[PDB]
């Protein structure tokens, strides 16, 4: 969410906080608290989670 940059058209490109690199067209998942977006491998995901399952990023999963 602060991990967002813009292109010449005003479009937004999200940056993965896990690897600190941009959306490169590969699958991504969004935190259900802070709405940062991550590449699947950077949070250990190989297949889609159960579609109803809540997902939270490592910062929001802290206790």
């Amino acid at each position: 969410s602060m991990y967002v940059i813009r292109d010449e058209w005003g479009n937004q490109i999200w940056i993965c906080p896990g690897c600190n690199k941009p959306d490169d067209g590969s699958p991504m998942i969004g935190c259900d608290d802070c709405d940062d977006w991550y590449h699947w491998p950077c949070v250990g995901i190989m297949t889609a989670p159960p579609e109803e399952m809540q997902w939270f990023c490592p910062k929001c999963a802290n206790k």
Partner: peptide, 7 residues
């Protein structure tokens, strides 16, 4: 979960 750009 909310996912984008999946196969």
């Amino acid at each position: 979960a909310r996912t984008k750009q999946t196969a």
